Amino acid sequence: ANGLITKIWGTAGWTFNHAVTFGYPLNPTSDDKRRYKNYFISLGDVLPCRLCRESYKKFITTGKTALTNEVLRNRHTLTKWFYDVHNAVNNKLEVDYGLSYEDVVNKYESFRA
Amino acid sequence: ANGLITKIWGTAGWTFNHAVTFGYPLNPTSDDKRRYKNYFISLGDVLPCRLCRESYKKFITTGKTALTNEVLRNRHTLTKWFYDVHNAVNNKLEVDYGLSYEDVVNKYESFRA
Ligand SMILES: Cc1cc2nc3c(=O)[nH]c(=O)nc-3n(C[C@H](O)[C@H](O)[C@H](O)COP(=O)(O)OP(=O)(O)OC[C@H]3O[C@@H](n4cnc5c(N)ncnc54)[C@H](O)[C@@H]3O)c2cc1C
Numbered sequence: 001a002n003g004l005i006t007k008i009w010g011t012a013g014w015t016f017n018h019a020v021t022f023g024y025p026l027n028p029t030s031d032d033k034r035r036y037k038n039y040f041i042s043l044g045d046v047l048p049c050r051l052c053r054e055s056y057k058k059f060i061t062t063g064k065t066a067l068t069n070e071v072l073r074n075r076h077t078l079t080k081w082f083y084d085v086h087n088a089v090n091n092k093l094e095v096d097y098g099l100s101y102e103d104v105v106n107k108y109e110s111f112r113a
Numbered sequence: 114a115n116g117l118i119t120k121i122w123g124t125a126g127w128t129f130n131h132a133v134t135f136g137y138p139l140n141p142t143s144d145d146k147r148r149y150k151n152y153f154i155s156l157g158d159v160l161p162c163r164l165c166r167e168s169y170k171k172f173i174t175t176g177k178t179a180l181t182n183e184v185l186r187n188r189h190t191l192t193k194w195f196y197d198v199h200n201a202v203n204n205k206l207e208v209d210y211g212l213s214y215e216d217v218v219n220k221y222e223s224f225r226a
C-alpha cells in the first residue's frame with residue numbers, strides 16, 4: 001500500500017508536467033533533449049500509484065505516445081506529445097475533455113514570462 | 114524567454130512532488146533508491162524557470178538539503194528531506210508558512226490508498 005489516491009496528486013501532476021513541456025526551448029540542444037528525455041522516463045518510476053506507473057510506461061513505449069527522439073525535436077513536438085499522453089490516460093479512464101492542442105497552447109502561453 | 118510565471122506551476126509542483134515522496138517504499142531496495150534519486154536530480158533540469166533550476170541544484174548538492182544516500186534510507190527520510198527542501202526555498206523567498214513536518218505527514222497520509 002505505497003500508493004496515494006489520485007485526488008491529491010493527479011491534477012497537480014498534469015499541470016506541473018504540462019508546464020514543464022512549455023518551458024522546453026523552441027530550438028533545444030543535444031543536452032536539453034537528453035535531460036528532458038531522462039526526466040520523463042524517470043517520471044514513470046515515481047508516480048505514487050502502481051497501476052499508474054504501469055500504464056504510463058506502456059503509453060510512452062508504444063504507439064503514437066511513444067517517447068522517441070522525434071518527440072524531443074522542439075517545444076511543439078514535446079508539448080504535443082504530452083498532450084497526447086494526457087488524452088491517452090483520459091480515454092483509458094473513460095473520459096474526454098474535448099480540449100484541442102491549441103486550447104492547451106493558449107492556456108499555458110498565457111503564463112509565459 | 115522559456116520561463117513560465119509560478120502561478121501556473123509552483124503549487125502544483127510542490128504538491129505533486131511531496132506526493133511522490135510519500136509513495137516511496139517503507140523499506141526500499143537498492144533499485145528503488147537509484148530510481149528515486151535519479152528522478153529528483155532530473156527534476157532540477159526541467160523546472161520552467163532559470164534561477165529556480167540553479168537554486169534547486171545548489172540546494173540538493175550542498176548543505177543539509179544535499180541529496181545523499183542517507184536521505185534515501187526510507188519513506189521517513191525521503192519525505193523529511195523534501196519537506197526541508199521546500200522550507201529552504203521558502204526561506205530564500207522570505208516566506209514563512211510555519212507548517213511542521215508532522216502537519217505535512219498528516220495531510221498526505223490522509224490520502225494513503
Ligand atoms: C502521468 C500521470 C499518470 C496517471 N495515470 C492514472 C491511472 O493510470 N489511473 C488512474 O486512476 N489515474 C491516473 N492518473 C490520474 C488522472 O489522470 C487524473 O488526474 C484524475 O483521475 C483526476 O481527474 P480529473 O478529472 O480532475 O482531471 P485531470 O485529468 O486531473 O484534470 C486535468 C485538467 O487538465 C485539462 N485537460 C484534460 N485533458 C487535457 C490534455 N490532454 N492536455 C492538457 N490539459 C488537459 C482540463 O482542464 C482538466 O481539468 C495520472 C496522472 C498523471 C499525472
Ligand SMILES: Cc1cc2nc3c(=O)[nH]c(=O)nc-3n(C[C@H](O)[C@H](O)[C@H](O)COP(=O)(O)OP(=O)(O)OC[C@H]3O[C@@H](n4cnc5c(N)ncnc54)[C@H](O)[C@@H]3O)c2cc1C
Nearest residue numbers: 119123124126127164165168169196199200202210212217
Ligand atoms: C523546486 C521549486 C523551486 C522554486 N523556486 C522559486 C523561485 O526561485 N522563485 C519564485 O518566486 N518561486 C519559486 N518557486 C515557486 C514557489 O515555491 C511557490 O510555489 C509560489 O511562490 C506560490 O506560493 P504559494 O504560497 O502557493 O506556496 P507553495 O510554496 O506553492 O505553496 C505550497 C503550499 O504547501 C504548503 N507548504 C509550505 N511549506 C511547506 C513545506 N515545507 N512542506 C510541505 N508543504 C509546505 C502550504 O500548505 C502551502 O500553501 C519554486 C517551486 C518549486 C516547485
